[PDB]
Each structure stands twice: as C-alpha cells, then as structure tokens.
Design a protein around this ligand. Structure first.
Ligand code: HEM
Ligand code: HEM
Ligand SMILES: NS(=O)(=O)c1ccc(-n2nc(C(F)(F)F)cc2-c2ccc(Br)cc2)cc1
Ligand SMILES: NS(=O)(=O)c1ccc(-n2nc(C(F)(F)F)cc2-c2ccc(Br)cc2)cc1
Ligand SMILES: *[C@@H]1O[C@H](CO)[C@@H](O)[C@H](O)[C@H]1NC(C)=O
Ligand SMILES: *[C@@H]1O[C@H](CO)[C@@H](O)[C@H](O)[C@H]1NC(C)=O
Ligand SMILES: *[C@@H]1O[C@H](CO)[C@@H](O)[C@H](O)[C@H]1NC(C)=O
Ligand SMILES: *[C@@H]1O[C@H](CO)[C@@H](O)[C@H](O)[C@H]1NC(C)=O
Ligand SMILES: *[C@@H]1O[C@H](CO)[C@@H](O)[C@H](O)[C@H]1NC(C)=O
Ligand SMILES: *[C@@H]1O[C@H](CO)[C@@H](O)[C@H](O)[C@H]1NC(C)=O
Lengths: 552, 552
C-alpha cells in the first residue's frame, strides 16, 4: 500500500505518505526540486555539468606515475590532495545516523538504540507489492540460483592486484571489531556497540572482559610463553569466554579479545601480533613515565595502538586496495578547518558489502605445506607449530582471490555467501540501482552493464529479469572490475565513504585529542605517525620478515 | 607527588608527568607557548587586546532597547547576531568529551563509558598535597561553616528578574532529563545515558519503560481521566516503577516517565502538561496521516515535542534568564555553514552549577492557600484538588528567590545545598579560579572580589583563607550578581556554553534531520517553530491562562 513503496523521490528527497494513496518528496537541502526532487537549480546544473565520473577520477588517480611522484614529493600538495579525497568522499554519510532495519522514518529509536546497524538506505516497507518495492515478482530469484549460477568459484581466480594472505587476514581481523552481528537478536543487530575502530577485538568487548585479559602490571595485556614466544592467555587461565569446538585441547583456547577470532588461525595470528604490540608500547611508555601506574600505561597504550591502526589502515591497507600512485596520508589536522563529525555509526551495508570471502584461497598454504579449510579452521598446532614468522612469510607470498569478477566464492564458504544473499533480503534491502543512485553513481541499463561479459549477464538476466531488481550483494561480486581492480565501481563507491568516516570520525582524530601527551608524550604520538604493517611485524615477529599487503 | 598537582599549564595546555618530579605543558593548539602556555603568538595578542569582557558584552546586550528593537525587526540581522551568540559561546566545549571523575588523562574509557558525566576540568590527582592541588590546608573549610555562614537564607530574597514559579519548576523538570545522577554508582555517574534533551523524562528512561506508558493507539501516551482532566496513568495500572512514600494512596502514584518527578507536585504538574501535549500532536499527526500506525505517530510526536522544547528553552527560558533585548532565535540552519558537532555529553559541573534551590520560595502558594515544603512534597490531592489552571495562575504570580546573591537557600533544602558542597569535593573538583580561567574569565583577587560586599567576604576569607581555594559551587551562589541579574558572571559563563551544545548539538538540530517530514510534515515542522511556553499552556490547560517565566 505505502505510496513510498515505489521510491518516487529522487536526488535524496525523503518520501512521505500523505494519505494512503499519496506521497510528497522532501527535496529540502537537495540540489533539485519538483515533485520527485529531479529538476535542478542552476548552481546544480553547473556542478553536474562539470563533475567527473568516479572512473574518469580513477583513471587520473591510477595513471601518470611521474606526476604523482612529483605530488608525493611536494608536501604542501600531497596534503591538499589528501584533504580533498577525505572531505568529498564522505559527504555521502548521514551522521548523525538515520534509519536501521525497523525504521524507514527518521525516529528517535533509530537514533538512540545503539544495538542496531545504521543503514544508508531505508528498508522496503513491509506492505509493498514486491520485495524490491514495486518492481519484480512476488518473490525474487532463488539464492542458490545466484549463489551457484553466478557466485560459486570453479577455478581459483587470483586478484589482479596481488593482495596476499597478510592483507586478506588483516581485512578480516580489522573489520571484525566493528562487524560483529548479534545474530541472537538478528541481522541488523550488532555487538560492536562502539560503532568504530575501538580496538575492542584486542581488548575485550567490555570492561569486565577487558579486565580478565589484563595483567594489571606495567599496563600490560596478559600473555603466555610457549617455547619462547608470547601467545595469548588461555581461556582456562583467564576466564574470558571464547568460542571453540568441544574437543579443542583447552590449551588451544587462546583468549585474545574478540570471541570469534579463535575459529581461524589467521585471525589468531594477528591477535598474537597486536597482543605483543601493546606490551611493546607499554614498556616504551613505562620508561618515558617510570612513575605511571598500570591503569595509565594501559589506557595510554590502547590509544597509541588505535593511532597506529588508523595509520596502517590508510597508509598501507587503503593505499594498497586503492592502487593509486598518489600517497594517501593519515593526518587528522587536515580536517581541522573543515566541517566534520568526529562521530560514527556502522551501517548494515558496510557489513554486507564487506563480505570479501572471494579473497579466500582453496588452500591455506603455509610454505612447505597446504591446509584444507577443514584443517585450517579452529587449529591449535598449526600456528604454534609453524611459528609467526612462518606465517608472515607464507602470507606475504600467496595470491588471494579477485573479489568482484564473478563466481569466485570458495565452495566451502558458499554457505556464508548464501546467507549474505538471503539475509540481506530478510533485512529488506533495496535494488542495486537505488544504491548506485544513492551513492551518486548511474544505475545500470543491463545485467550486461553490470557484468561486462555476456554469459553471467544472461544467466542473471534470466533470473532477475529486470536490471532494476538486481541485488546490492551479488551484483557486487559479479560486477565488472574497474581495469585490474580487485572489485568494481559499485563496491568501491558505497564503501570508500563508509570506510573513511569510521577512521577519521574517531575521537583521537579529533582536534581535542590529536596532540602529543594524549598518547603519553611526543614519543607515543610519534609511534602512530611512523606506523606501518611492515614495522608492526618487524617489531613483533621473531625474525623481522619483510611483509606487505601485496604478493611481492 | 604528581607534578601536575599544581595545575602549572595555563591557557589550556594539558599538563603531563614527565618523571615523578617533572611535567610538560601541551600548549598545542592554544594561542600561547613557553613552559606554561602563557606567552602569546602575535595573532593572540591582537585578539586579546581587542576582546570585550563578558560584562562589557553583557552591558551592550542588556542596554539600548530601541536599537535592539531595530535589530529584532531586521531578520537578516537578528540571525547574524544569533548565529554569533551560538558559534562563539560554545568553542569552550570538549566534544568529543574528554575526562570524567576517574580520568584526569584523555583515556578511551573516559570516552567510551557513557555512564559517566564528562568534566570540563580534570579532577585533582588523588596524590596531591592539598585537596585543591597544592594550595590550602590539609582539609578545606567545613561544609556548614559555608552552608550556614554563607549559604542559608534568612529572609526570602526575591529574584530581581521576576522569575516566577512556572519558570522555577520548568528549569527543574527540564534539566531533570539530563541531570539524573546514579547515586548507587556515585556522583559523577548518570542515568541520563542519552546525554541531552532526549525527552526521556516524559517517555521513560528506556524502551521497556517507554512501552509501559504508551497506549499503543494513535501514537498516544497513556493517560487517565479524573473528573474531567487527563492525568498520567497509575503505577498500579501501568506497572512503570515510580518513587513514592510508603503511604501514598496508590492512586496518587502517577506514571509520567522520569521516576523522581512524583516527589514534587510542580514536577507532576509539568509532566501532565507534556503528556497532554503528546496526544494533542498525535491527533494532528493522526489527521495528517490517516494511514499512519501507532508506532509512527508516537515516533514522529517525540520528535516534534523535542523540537518544541528546544524552541521554548531558547526563545522563552534562555530569553528570560538572559534579560537581553536582542531576541534569541532557535534556528538550526544558522549553524549549518559552521563547524559544529551535533553531539553532546553532559558534564558534572553543569549538573552541580545548576543546583538552583535558591530559586525556591518558603511557601508554595497556590493562590488562596500556601503550603509548607512538608505539605507540598509528594502530594496527591494538592494538584488534583487545585487543578492545572490553578497552578499555572498561582505560579505566573509568585516571585522566586534570587540565585547568586548570598545566603538564600531554603533551610529545608539546606541538606541538598550541603551535599552539593561536600559531594563536589568527593568528586575532587578544582578551585573557583581555575574554572574562571578555564572559561576565559579572570580569577578573583579577593573574597571581596567574589562577593561585592564585605560581610560574607570576610566570613569566607576567614574560612578559605586563599581566594584561590574558594570552591566553584558556593562561590556561585555567594557571588556578586551582575546588575539586577539572578546570578553573576561565573555562573552565567560556565553554563551558557554547556547549555547551548546540549540544545543545538542534538540530532534533530542536524542538517540531516532539520527538514519538514522528519516531523511528519510541514505541519509538524511548523509546530516546533511556533512553540512557546505561552502556547504550551493555552493548548493544554483547562482555561487558556496567560503565563510566563516572569512574575507579570
Ligand atoms: C577462514 C576464512 C573465513 C571463514 C571460514 C569465514 C566465515 C564466515 C562466516 C561463517 C560468516 C557468517 C555468515 C553470514 O555472514 O551470514 C562470515 C561473515 C563475514 N565474513 Fe567471513 N570468513 C572468513 C574470512 C573472511 C575474511 C578474510 C573477511 C574479511 C576481509 C571476511 C568478512 C566477513 C564479513 C564482513 C562477514 C560478516 C560479519 C558480521 O556479520 O559481523 N570473512 N564469514
Ligand atoms: C521542591 C523543590 C525541590 C526539592 C524539594 C529538591 C530536592 C532535591 C534533592 C532531594 C536532591 C538530591 C540531593 C543531592 O543532590 O545529593 C536534589 C538534587 C538536585 N536538584 Fe533539587 N529540589 C527542588 C528543586 C530544584 C530546582 C528548582 C532545581 C533546578 C533549577 C533543582 C536542581 C537540582 C539538581 C540539578 C540536582 C541534582 C539532580 C541529580 O542528581 O541528577 N532542584 N534536589
Ligand atoms: N578500483 S579499486 O578496486 O582498486 C579501489 C579504488 C579505490 C579504493 N579506495 N580509495 C579510497 C580513497 F580514495 F578514498 F582513499 C577509498 C577506497 C576504498 C577502501 C575500502 C573500501 Br571497503 C572501499 C573503497 C578502493 C579500491
Ligand atoms: N547576567 S545574567 O545572570 O542575567 C545571564 C545572562 C545570560 C545568560 N544566558 N545567555 C545565553 C545566550 F546568550 F547564549 F543565549 C545563555 C545564558 C545562560 C543560560 C543558562 C545557564 Br545555566 C547559563 C547561562 C544567562 C544569565
Ligand atoms: C515522479 O514519478 C511519478 C511516477 O508515477 C510521476 O507521476 C511524477 O510526475 C514524477 N515527478 C517528477 C518531478 O519526476
Ligand atoms: C533496541 O531495540 C530493540 C527492538 O525494540 C530492543 O529489543 C532492544 O532492547 C533495544 N536495545 C536497547 C539497548 O534499548
Ligand atoms: C590441525 O593441524 C594438525 C597439525 O598441524 C593437522 O594434523 C590436523 O589435520 C589439523 N586439523 C584438521 C581439522 O585438519
Ligand atoms: C609555571 O607554573 C608552575 C606552577 O606550578 C611554576 O612552578 C613554574 O615556575 C611556572 N613557570 C613559569 C615560566 O612561569
Ligand atoms: C563504567 O565504568 C564503571 C566503573 O568502571 C563500571 O562499573 C560500569 O560497568 C561502566 N559502564 C559501562 C557501560 O561499561
Ligand atoms: C497534602 O495536601 C492536602 C490537601 O491539599 C493537605 O491537607 C495535606 O496536609 C498535604 N499532605 C501533607 C503530608 O501535609
């Protein structure tokens, strides 16, 4: 019934049910007017008729090495550039957050209840004619008819950017502090209440849990020595609850912080990395402040690490996943003179679209041995046996799958990829084009437009019929990759904005926190600003292995 | 021991313990440098040597009626002015919030734990030589040697601004959504987790409770008809827990929302006001959207009411409490082009300094009768008997005490006034001057400077000895009143900044929410912007009595 079913209002205008059969578009603060918020004000016209495509943008940004070389040299230019990528990229986020799974209208419950995931686009009214609003059939294609037909891998497709397993597992561990779906409540419900890079994954989801992992000495995190290496405390020792198969030796049962992380040795490898990083900081802090107490050292360290994390995640991770030329820069002071909300609330889309299982290899090959999913998952001795350095090295040299090519999901994790499809449907998501429009992209004219090939296109077209009924999730993995990109424009466009407001819109990035001392000193401050995944490992791993987020 | 005990760093520079015996000042982002952040950069000099005193500011603002008249006529001027009062006033707030009772250093716990009250000035290190850091004696004056000597009232002193009982009880009910100290945890701990004007006081502190008050019909709040007037549901009826003396008839036991509000008939009078306002909106919304459901009408209503509340609290409450000439204006779009954080976290100072018991009369005189505290407190039949209109009228005509004159605290509420003193001491607060400096005010040279008279000055001087050991709280009520002001500069300066970021720094005030429709329509939006305490009553109270926040 709901007259706004049909998503009438374009250009961002909010739609409203003015009488069962009627609706009105709140074109307020859009650049357009007229019943559907579509006809522009001259200024708009001028902007529009002078705006370059994310691709025409991407081209420049990925070409002209030498020039970008010159820019990367000129500091008073790199910053100008960085400042801009930052500023514009995030105008697309509604922070303060609007909407969630149960609120299609602004609502204070949608604003207060931190247990939800914000949502870039309001769900589809439960009283609509079709699940995509008005277009489509009484039902949508079947999940497996998309999962198998268009999503499951045949031959392992390698990423054309050389994303290794170091990167792959990092993107998993990292995003896993904010992504934490509270399934007991349902999809759309999170447990990463601190909506953002709160390093909760290392430090326990609470205070109570955070305490059960702390040594309460020199600001240190509890650890344990196995043969000669520091490994996380045991659930048996520090009663911090974990998730482990009812047979794991109880000596495997590592503690780490984020309760799921024990289900994959890659994760557990990274926690052991950071666990060690904390202490390492703690000591530095401890000899810069011989008079600090445990609680201070601890509280200052978590700040520093977070500081480091935002650096690596921009200077290395985004830098790699971008494949630019221009050198991205983690510099909070760049946003200081601009309007910015040092506030964030993670959406469900960001979660969904971040399901990068296509990154996953068919064998977890730790040099001089390859393991099956069945063997790698929930394994104690794998990590303990091989060693950290022999993980760092294996992973530096191991191509991970390309993401948005088509049909590259590990037949194992096909179940997950399944859920994703039929779960995002449960959460009543919107059509792939409404999202494209929403993120200032132009909707696709054909499944063929979406894919850049004919085979799948026709397979999907067969199923979905209308392009305007294609889903955000599938369309993302079976999307035409920009050049030798790991994924296409649609992925890259919805996610860039979301991934920067969670990094930058973080208290430490605030002008009130961004100063030495907040980090114990000038010292601590100059740890954040010298961070790199390269150092993270050379500082914490038995050798000082070379590493990267690229396959050498 | 802590080298930062003596609060060395001036001009905002954060102080840090660099070695037991040493410290450094983080003059970063201040206008000053040099060991203590005190010597200015030329630009600073220029600003300073060109900035007008809050008094030299106040004078203009309270004088020249005719000019201000001209201004209040010119809309393209009033706004310019309003925009300014807004912008500058709040540069003084650390949002994102830094500090709380347990954190003298930035800390992530201080940032995360929403159960705390932020704190404009960090507490005094528990290892200091004197409770005020380094100045003063092993102890401070006694509470009663201040409570009695300088704070308890003798003759009722009337406010020179004509603040009536309508205003008095409004300032109580209103601030009582944000102020809600969780004493079980201790002072410094709140229960108004939605740090701000979340109208939780009308709607229950939760979701669970909010449900136990709603009708789940037409978006309406539950009510009950007693003789002919709508009065809140009964605890017995709506199991919403309340706080009532173990003898109250169980028919008194009104529900309303904020659990304490039953302990004073004035509070209960105002809740009954709003309860009725909700419904009144709900019906308007209900015949604007004949197709809305209860949950939508309810969710849209709370937003409109909040909208109204911010209007009244600026346009009437602040407007009256200011005694300006220039017509303040609630216009969220004024901050749209300025850097602003639509985010807030209520401090403990704001709470403490807002203890305006001096406002309280010795008799709650509802025309043709006068009640004792003993009688007015927790009374059923008072309100039910007299009626709302006969409360509105009594209160419009009833002068309330002056606040910051000296010695005007009701001997009843002396206990509260006591707590305040020795509680803010518990929370380890700082000297009256550190705060004055903190809020860009010049510290006092004598108790005499503080008071503007000689009697009390010497009585306090006797006690405190050093002016620099005078406390924020007492010095606030025993402070020299600006002209015919209800309180002086110190109160007005710490609070103005705090009271605006809680109003403006609210999601609905955001450019993402500030549009029609968010409020159900242009209609709902045009309720917020036509709001007034005058209307609030004429729309909800049996007559349509004239009212104000001034004694006629
Ligand atoms: C050993 C490899 C991995 C396994 C076995 C695995 C398994 C799973 C499973 C069981 C789910 C839940 C199913 C659902 O979403 O409905 C899931 C969710 C997810 N996975 Fe993985 N995953 C792995 C690696 C990764 C990596 C490398 C990334 C990150 C780049 C990733 C990102 C996600 C995301 C974002 C979700 C949603 C998390 C949430 O709901 O909060 N996964 N994965
Ligand atoms: C009938 C008049 C009133 C009575 C009997 C009363 C009584 C009290 C009592 C019992 C307390 C708790 C003691 C403590 O703080 O440790 C208190 C706290 C407080 N009162 Fe009042 N009060 C009255 C009016 C007011 C008014 C008019 C204001 C506001 C302008 C005010 C503001 C406060 C504040 C801010 C607190 C702290 C609330 C909290 O802890 O969250 N009071 N009052
Ligand atoms: N064409 S590509 O696939 O190689 C590609 C191109 C650019 C980016 N990139 N650049 C930016 C920046 F410019 F804003 F920094 C943000 C992201 C980004 C990061 C994480 C997510 Br999730 C989504 C986007 C990523 C991939
Ligand atoms: N000299 S005075 O006592 O009469 C006096 C003068 C001005 C104000 N006033 N003006 C403003 C505004 F200008 F920003 F609107 C805010 C406050 C304000 C409101 C609440 C608290 Br709590 C503290 C300050 C209040 C009293
Ligand atoms: C909005 O879309 C509807 C489709 O039914 C159309 O009738 C209406 O005229 C459109 N308005 C504008 C401004 O595009
Ligand atoms: C959030 O909302 C859901 C649904 O109303 C509810 O079950 C849950 O209790 C809420 N969470 C909080 C913290 O109020
Ligand atoms: C776990 O690792 C051990 C030794 O590293 C291996 O024998 C075993 O097969 C692995 N677990 C599974 C389930 O394959
Ligand atoms: C800075 O202030 C502190 C206050 O404790 C004092 O010890 C120090 O001598 C001052 N230094 C200067 C240069 O004013
Ligand atoms: C806030 O801190 C206090 C003291 O550490 C603790 O009792 C309480 O659980 C904390 N609140 C939350 C929500 O963590
Ligand atoms: C409550 O009010 C009634 C009637 O207004 C009055 O007679 C009675 O004394 C009051 N209660 C107390 C405890 O004084």
């Amino acid at each position: 019934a709901n007259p706004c079913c049909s998503n009438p209002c374009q250009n961002r205008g909010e739609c409203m049910s003015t009488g069962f059969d009627q609706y009105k578009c709140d074109c307020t603060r859009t650049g357009f007017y007229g019943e559907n918020c579509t006809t522009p004000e001259f200024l708009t016209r001028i902007k529009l008729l002078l705006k370059p495509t994310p691709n025409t943008v991407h081209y420049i940004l990925t070409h002209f090495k030498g020039v970008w070389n010159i820019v990367n040299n000129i500091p008073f230019l790199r910053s100008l550039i960085m400042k801009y990528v930052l500023t514009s990229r995030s105008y697309l986020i509604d922070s303060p957050p609007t909407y969630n799974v149960h609120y299609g209208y602004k609502s204070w419950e949608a604003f207060s209840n931190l247990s939800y995931y914000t949502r870039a686009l309001p769900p589809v009214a439960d009283d609509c004619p079709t699940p995509m609003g008005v277009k489509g059939n009484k039902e949508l294609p079947d999940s497996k008819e998309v999962l198998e037909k268009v999503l499951l891998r045949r031959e392992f497709i390698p990423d054309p950017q050389g994303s290794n397993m170091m990167f792959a597992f990092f993107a998993q561990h990292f995003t896993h502090q904010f992504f934490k779906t509270d399934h007991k409540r349902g999809p759309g419900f999170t447990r990463g209440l601190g909506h953002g890079v709160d390093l909760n994954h290392i430090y326990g989801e609470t205070l109570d849990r955070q305490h059960k992992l702390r040594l309460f000495k020199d600001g240190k995190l509890k650890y344990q020595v196995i043969g000669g290496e520091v490994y996380p405390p045991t659930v048996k020792d520090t009663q911090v609850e974990m998730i482990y198969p009812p047979h794991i030796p109880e000596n495997l049962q590592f503690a780490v912080g984020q309760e799921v992380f024990g289900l994959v040795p890659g994760l557990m490898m990274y926690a052991t990395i950071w666990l060690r990083e904390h202490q390492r900081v703690c000591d530095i802090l401890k000899q810069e402040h011989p008079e600090w107490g445990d609680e201070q050292l601890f509280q200052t360290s978590k700040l520093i690490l977070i500081g480091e994390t935002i650096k690596i995640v921009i200077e290395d991770y985004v830098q790699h996943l971008s494949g630019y030329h221009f050198k991205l820069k983690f510099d909070p002071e760049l946003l200081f003179n601009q309007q910015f909300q040092y506030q964030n609330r993670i959406a469900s889309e960001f979660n969904t679209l971040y399901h990068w299982h296509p990154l996953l290899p068919d064998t977890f090959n730790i040099e001089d041995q390859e393991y099956s999913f069945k063997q790698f998952l929930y394994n104690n001795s794998i990590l303990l046996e091989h060693g950290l350095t022999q993980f760092v090295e294996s992973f530096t040299r191991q191509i991970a799958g390309r993401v948005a090519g088509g049909r590259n999901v590990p037949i194992a994790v096909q179940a997950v990829a399944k859920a994703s499809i039929d779960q995002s449907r449960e959460m009543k998501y919107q059509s792939l084009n409404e999202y494209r429009k929403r993120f200032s992209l132009k909707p696709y004219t054909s499944f063929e437009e979406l894919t850049g090939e004919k085979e799948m296109a026709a397979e999907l077209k067969a199923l979905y019929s209308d392009i305007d009924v294609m889903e955000l999730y599938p369309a993302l993995l079976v999307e035409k990759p920009r050049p030798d990109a790991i994924f296409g424009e649609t992925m890259v466009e919805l996610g860039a904005p979301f991934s920067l407001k969670g990094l930058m819109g973080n208290p430490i990035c605030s002008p009130q926190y961004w100063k030495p001392s907040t980090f114990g000193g000038e010292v601590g401050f100059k740890i954040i600003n010298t961070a790199s995944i390269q150092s993270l490992i050379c500082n914490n791993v038995k050798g000082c292995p070379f590493t990267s987020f690229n396959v050498q």
